Design an enzyme around this catalytic site. Sequence first.
Site: not given
Ligand SMILES: Cc1cnc(Nc2cc(F)c(C3CCN(C)CC3)c(F)c2)nc1Nc1ccc(F)c(NS(=O)(=O)C(C)(C)C)c1
Length: 289
Positions: A13-14, A18, A21, A40, A134
Site C-alpha cells: 500500500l505504501g 522507516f 504497509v 505495517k 507528522d
Molecule cells: C494503516 C492503513 C490502513 N489502510 C490503508 N488503506 C489503503 C492505503 C492505500 F495506499 C491504498 C491505495 C494503494 C495504491 N495507491 C495508489 C494509493 C492508494 C488503498 F487502496 C488503501 N492504509 C494504511 N496505511 C498506509 C498505506 C499506504 C500509505 F502510503 C500510507 N501512508 S503513511 O502513513 O504516511 C506511511 C506508509 C506510514 C509513510 C499509509
Amino acid sequence: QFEERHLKFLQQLGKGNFGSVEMCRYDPLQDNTGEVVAVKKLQHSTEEHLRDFEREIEILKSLQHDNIVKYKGVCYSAGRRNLKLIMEYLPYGSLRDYLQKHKERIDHIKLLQYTSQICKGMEYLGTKRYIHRDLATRNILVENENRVKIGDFGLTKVLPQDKEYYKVKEPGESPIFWYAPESLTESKFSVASDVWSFGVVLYELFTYIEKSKSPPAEFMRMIGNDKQGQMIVFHLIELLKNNGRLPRPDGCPDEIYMIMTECWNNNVNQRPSFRDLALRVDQIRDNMA
Ligand SMILES: Cc1cnc(Nc2cc(F)c(C3CCN(C)CC3)c(F)c2)nc1Nc1ccc(F)c(NS(=O)(=O)C(C)(C)C)c1
C-alpha cells in the site's frame, strides 16, 4: 494473536520511513473467509527502530476513536524480530489520493466535514499527551465518503509529564514544509506545533492536492528553487520569520484562510486549540448548510 503463516500478502500500500504497509488477507482457515487487514512492518529491523516501533504499537493500541485507524493486533516470527503491526484496512486510501481523485465531487462543506473529523482526532491525541508531529493528507486515511481517520503514528511521541513540548532530532528526511518554525529551529514539538501542521493540512484540502499548489512547491517557489540542501531549511526559517505564508487556495473563503493563518502564528502560545478549531469549522459548516 496473528500468526505469520496465515498472513497472505496481496499488495503493498505504501512505503515511507522507516517501514512500509502491506495489504494482506489474514485467512487462517485457508478458505478465503478471513478479512483484509493492513500490515505495517519495518524495512530494516534495527534495535533502534524496533524500540520505536514497539512504542508506536502501544500508542495506537491505547487509542480508541472514530477518527483513529483501528488497531487489531500484532504478528511476529520466532523471537521478537520480524514484528508486524496489524490494523484495519481502509478501502479508499489516504485523503491525499482520495481528494485528488474525486476533486470534482467534493465541495467545500465536505472538506469541512473532514476538517472537523481531523480536529476531533487530534484533540483526542492531545488528551493522551500525544504529539503526532507528522500530520498530513498522506497520513489521513479514508474509510468511506463520510469518515476519515488518522492512519499513521510512526512519529508520534508521548510528552514528558513535566513539559509541554518534546525535543527530538531524527536523522533522515523531515517534512519541513509541514513543521512549525520552532520545530525547525529548536526541534521542539508540541500540541501547538501540531496546530501549525494542521493549518497546512487545511491548506492541502482546499488546494485539492494540485501538484503545483503543494506546500513544498509553493514554499520552494517563494524561497527560490535554486536553493541547495541545508540552505533550503535556512531560507524557509527566514521566510517564516518574516510572515511568509502559503497563499490562499483557489476558491477558499476568507474565513477558512484565516484559520490557516491563525494556525500559522509564529507565537507558539497564540495558536488556537483543536477544540476551538473544531468549533469554528463546525460554525462555518453550519452556516454553509
Ligand atoms: C494503516 C492503513 C490502513 N489502510 C490503508 N488503506 C489503503 C492505503 C492505500 F495506499 C491504498 C491505495 C494503494 C495504491 N495507491 C495508489 C494509493 C492508494 C488503498 F487502496 C488503501 N492504509 C494504511 N496505511 C498506509 C498505506 C499506504 C500509505 F502510503 C500510507 N501512508 S503513511 O502513513 O504516511 C506511511 C506508509 C506510514 C509513510 C499509509
